[PDB]
Amino acid sequence: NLFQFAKMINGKLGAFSVWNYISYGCYCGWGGQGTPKDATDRCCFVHDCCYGRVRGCNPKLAIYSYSFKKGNIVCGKNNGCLRDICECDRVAANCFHQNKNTYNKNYKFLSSSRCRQTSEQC
Amino acid sequence: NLFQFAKMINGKLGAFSVWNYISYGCYCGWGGQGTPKDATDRCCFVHDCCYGRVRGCNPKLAIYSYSFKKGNIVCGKNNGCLRDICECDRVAANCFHQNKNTYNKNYKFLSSSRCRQTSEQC
Ligand SMILES: CCCCCCCC/C=C\CCCCCCCC(N)=O
User: Fold this and answer.
1) Would you call A97 exposed, middle or buried from its count of C-beta atoms within 10 A (0-12, 13-18, 19+)?
2) Measured between CA atoms, how close is A62 to chain B, in angstroms?
3) What is the CATH number of domain A1-122?
4) Is B29 helix (H, G, I), strand (E, B) or coil?
5) What are the φ and ψ backbone dihedral angles of A79, each rounded to 5 degrees?
6) CB-closest option in A2, A31, A58 to B2
7) Per-residue DSSP letters for A23-81?
8) Taking CA atoms, what residue in B is nearest to A51?
9) How many angstroms does the Cα of residue A73 sit away from the middle of ligand 1?
10) What span, in angstroms and rounded, lies between the C-alpha atoms of A31 and A35?
11) In chain B, what are the domain boundaries?
């Protein structure tokens, strides 16, 4: 769900990383507006989209099957919206590692007026 | 959207308040499994359930219209799902205020093991 995405995060992020994703960019953690200030914060957008597209079932509450073969991410059964959900997180969690180098603390807990600009479509 | 939402919490339940729903209980913050704990937790959950009902929109990424009628959150003349999403965020919000003292600091942060159970139904 999100409890997982978290562990799914920590997993490929060395435990206590989700904390750095509590409130980032215009999309990360609490957010949803203007344009993605950062690629990492863009990782977020996706995940939001990814979920946003998901047909019918609830993610915040969706409980799925996922594993970590050799410290690496792997989603279980390839059937159901769950296939989908477990995907975002995977990717997401991953997209993270993909840009952990471009992380701007100065982008932590920003303010609305930071993203007040026009939205940006998925 | 979270932001919109965020504000609400800062609004009705003072500032910095948000930071206290960042994570707490099986359903507040990052979570989504097992049964709730007390009240506050329930407050969230439903929201999630509320978010759960909705369709054709993304509560994370939606952007409704709200405002405090000088003292209490109020979702103004709507046009669709926003109508809802707002309301969702709206009450869930009021919902917290409805049970402040009941807050239990030690319920903020569970190992996702404190909930290790099956998410109930909406
Ligand atoms: C690729 C990055 C992923 C996008 C960012 C995901 C961050 C998750 C945000 C949601 C959890 C924050 C707490 C709000 C949830 C409280 C739920 C309740 N019903 O209000």
Assistant:
1) middle
2) 7
3) 1.20.90.10
4) coil
5) -135, 130
6) A31
7) S-SSSSSS---S--SSHHHHHHHHHHHHHHH--SS-SSS----EE-GGG--EE--S-SH
8) B58
9) 21
10) 11
11) 1-122
